[PDB]
């Protein structure tokens, strides 16, 4: 459906086997093409990594960590999860790779923030810190409402059909008052015959205002975001595994590194050392899908205008740290089933898994943070980096936080080869550096999340691969 | 565990083979109590009933349908969701129920209902709502705390703090205006390169509010309704069926319709009919698990006031119809992976499917209605019925609704079958409900109509195990 069969002999070397590069290869080879992979790593998927028992990564500073999570479980290191919007749904149907539900929203996980209230560093539930935000600023719309404050703008029936709304949304007394829901949970559940159980009690305005607990909420609001959410059974890395089986590992050059890439006479040629020998291919096209801040280290015959347009693309941080507890508390005390509980704290949230519900065994994702606290981890090692994980999520979810734990695997992008970055943000920001990066260069295309309107996910690495062939294919056809 | 172990020879015949007579042998079992199930259905589980291929049902109006749903295909005709702090969720730990999540909420499912506005009949996306509704709210706030309207309530670091939220919440303008947001949605997605996309537009504020857009946002809020939710992989019956092989189907007599019911000197005996021979069962107690206005028809000795307290618990309607399509159009158009569209018309919801994602063919449940907007297909035949829930829904979801139909099945709790109703609606803790917490001598009444989560299996379930604990403690004295 992307495009028509090819005509003749035509050839494509794609450096990088990410998910923009294993995409354009799959579409490449169904419209006839000859393509070839090459990927530095020993692993299909790029920023798509799912580590699990067996899993071994040293990073650029040097440390190797081992994964030892038991069979079956596993946590993303990158890519964890995806609205219905996008591409990559797709995909996972034509590749026969199962999803399911992502939990993105949770009424029983947590939010925890400092302040200058006394909910400062309390972990409030969200359907808690919801029934109170939503009941008082109902009621003060309600009081705005009634006292005449909106005259100007809110017709009478207007101001009727407000108020009626708000009464129900902020679950408020008949006289406007906001003083507590059962939509804020309970102490005790209520149960059968005379046991009604008991309401978890509202705490004040003024401390619910400035403890700033709503501070979240918008998050399930995200395009990309909101809930319902999707993800493959048993990884997001079984996408780029379906990409690989169906391309051929024939087409694929693993342990291939790039270190040149140039314009030739007949198309590109790329060199590459891979089984320790220095190597090279040339294809009448090329497409790059190494990272920009990553493509400057290559040999290349690169225009100068085009090597400063790679720059503007500046890298990031990010990361992860997840941990197998050999019991499912979180599940079994606190009634969280999947979801992430959010915070201040560096680790910034906390996020429970969505698979093995009820099970005897779990990999919590201890941290997921980006920018200034995700610099607080990179430089740690990662017996330093559990240690700040569980002393800060001890401060949320209690003491059991610090018990039954097996093992842990961290990842730090910023700090891990082939990626050197979680993803891109232009400076200025289309900048005109990223729109001189959609232009080929003679047989050089460049592809990859960071040419997208959605950075940082996957459907931007999908959709650009996918332009991306339509114009090589556009250019052979004439 | 519930309660110990039973010391000598204690027998309890239980009526119904529902979730609170099936929760109630299995924890009176495990304690070592000799006792009997009596199930007037082929199947356990009662208004727990999971529609698949082959299922026959024949209502109380006498028409008889047969669900052809492909292998691996169904919808829950009864309980379908279960929040995080049921007991229910702990049973089926206990049983080795796989469950997942249920889509309770999403943002690409639609509303539509009636109004004075250009909005009547519009299918608006929930995120597209929301957006607009939280939007203007936020900006409404927003102008009459910075106009000082607040000022007696709130201090100015109060509305700072608020306004912070307020812009956020509401995706407010620098200025402090709902101009729209990209949480609305895209008419064109955004792709790669100068591909941006084309944001979807907002109403304006009088179209929001006018339309009442917003009326089922407090929905996502319900105590047992927010996510995360949960349901049994391939059907909730599976709770059932797992409590039925634990329990072991000889201490189970399906088809055993109950017909009498009595306290006598040795115990409790109940007669019931299966397999249209008559037979007969004593007992040291009973627990009736049996919906309470159907426990008048049965021969008994209860208290003149104990049977008017049982009238009490009005009978309540709610069904539900689901369409097996042969291409699920809903992931592929229109971007929804389950949830539900809410709409004021009869149909009340569409919910699609938490499984089978991106497979060929999937069941819809057209509609899931209740009280007056049930009443309006219950005396319709299955025909009508699905005449409509088509034409309804393809007032929301387009022509598409009406295409690549292969089957259908429906059910109307009230019409049928040993529930005659979908829970309880006491009249008026009620003097009713509370008499009938008491023994009739040997005989326990237990269900979700004695409960405070009644149409809920936590009401059964807890129902059960406080009338098991209580038989225990009698015993023990
Ligand atoms: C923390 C984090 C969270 C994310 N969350 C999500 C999410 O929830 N959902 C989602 O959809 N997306 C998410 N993503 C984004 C998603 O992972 C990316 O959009 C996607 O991986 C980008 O694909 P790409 O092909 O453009 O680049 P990459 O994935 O970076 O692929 C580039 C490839 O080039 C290779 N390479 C580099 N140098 C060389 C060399 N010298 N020679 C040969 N090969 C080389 C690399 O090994 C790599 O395989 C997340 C990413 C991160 C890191
Ligand atoms: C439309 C609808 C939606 C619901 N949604 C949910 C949901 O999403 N989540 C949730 O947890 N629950 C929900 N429920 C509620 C749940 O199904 C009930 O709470 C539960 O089934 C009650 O169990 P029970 O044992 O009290 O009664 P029942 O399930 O009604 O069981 C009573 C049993 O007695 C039997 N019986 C009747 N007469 C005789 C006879 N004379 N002799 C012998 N046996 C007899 C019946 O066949 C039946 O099996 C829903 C219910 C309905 C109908
Ligand atoms: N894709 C991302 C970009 C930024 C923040 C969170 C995510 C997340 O989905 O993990
Ligand atoms: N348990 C019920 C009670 C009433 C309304 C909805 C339901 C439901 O969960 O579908």
């Known amino acids: 459906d992307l495009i028509g069969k090819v005509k003749g ?77 996008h591409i990559t749904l797709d ?19 947590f939010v925890n923030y400092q302040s200058d209230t006394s909910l400062s560093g309390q972990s409030v539930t969200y359907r808690a810190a919801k029934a109170d935000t939503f009941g008082y600023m109902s009621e003060l719309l309600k009081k705005a409402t009634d006292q005449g404050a909106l005259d100007q703008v809110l017709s009478r029936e207007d101001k009727d059909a407000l108020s009626e709304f708000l009464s129900d949304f902020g679950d408020l007394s008949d006289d406007g008052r906001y003083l507590g829901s059962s939509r ?61 089986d169906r391309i051929g590992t024939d087409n694929i050059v693993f342990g291939a590194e790039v270190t040149s890439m140039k314009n030739v006479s007949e198309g590109v040629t790329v060199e590459y050392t891979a089984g320790g020998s220095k190597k090279s291919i040339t294809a009448d096209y090329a497409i790059c899908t190494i990272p920009p801040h990553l493509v400057g280290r290559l040999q290349n015959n690169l225009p100068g205008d085009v090597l400063t347009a ?10 992860k740290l997840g941990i197998e507890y050999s019991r499912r508390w979180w599940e079994t005390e606190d009634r969280i089933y999947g979801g992430a509980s959010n915070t201040d704290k560096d680790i910034s949230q906390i996020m429970f898994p969505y698979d093995h519900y ?66 891109a943000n232009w400076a200025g920001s289309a900048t005109p550096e990223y729109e001189k990066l959609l232009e080929p260069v003679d047989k050089i295309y460049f592809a990859g999340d960071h040419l997208s309107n959605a950075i940082a996910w996957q459907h931007g690495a999908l959709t650009s691969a996918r332009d991306v062939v339509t114009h090589i294919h556009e250019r052979v056809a004439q």
């Open 184 to 244: 804020r949970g309970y102490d005790s559940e209520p149960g059968a015959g005379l046991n009604f159980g008991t309401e978890k009690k509202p705490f004040a305005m003024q401390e619910v205002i400035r403890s700033g607990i709503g501070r979240n909420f918008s998050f399930d609001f995200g395009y990309d975001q909101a809930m319902m959410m999707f993800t493959p059974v048993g990884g997001m890395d079984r996408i780029y595994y379906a990409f690989q």
């Open 310 to 319: 790679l720059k503007a693309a500046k890298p990031s941080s990010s990361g």
């Open 91 to 109: 995909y996972c149907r034509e590749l026969g790779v199962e999803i399911q539900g992502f939990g993105n929203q949770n009424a029983n996980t």
């Open 358 to 423: 009820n099970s005897d065994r779990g990999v919590v994702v201890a941290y997921y943070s980006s920018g200034k606290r995700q610099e607080a981890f990179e430089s740690l090692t990662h017996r330093q980096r559990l240690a700040k994980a569980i002393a800060e999520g001890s401060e949320i979810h209690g003491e059991k936080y610090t018990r039954d734990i097996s093992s842990s695997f961290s990842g730090s992008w910023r700090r891990t080869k082939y990626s050197e970055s979680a993803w």
């Open 9 to 85: 002999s035509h050839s494509v070397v794609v450096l990088g086997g990410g998910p923009a590069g294993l995409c354009s290869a799959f579409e490449l080879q169904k419209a006839g093409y000859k393509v070839t992979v090459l990927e530095a790593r020993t692993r299909p998927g790029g920023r798509v990594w799912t580590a699990r028992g067996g899993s071994e990564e040293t990073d650029l500073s040097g440390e190797t960590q081992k994964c030892t999570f038991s069979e079956g479980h596993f946590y993303n290191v990158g890519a964890t999860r995806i609205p219905q919007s």
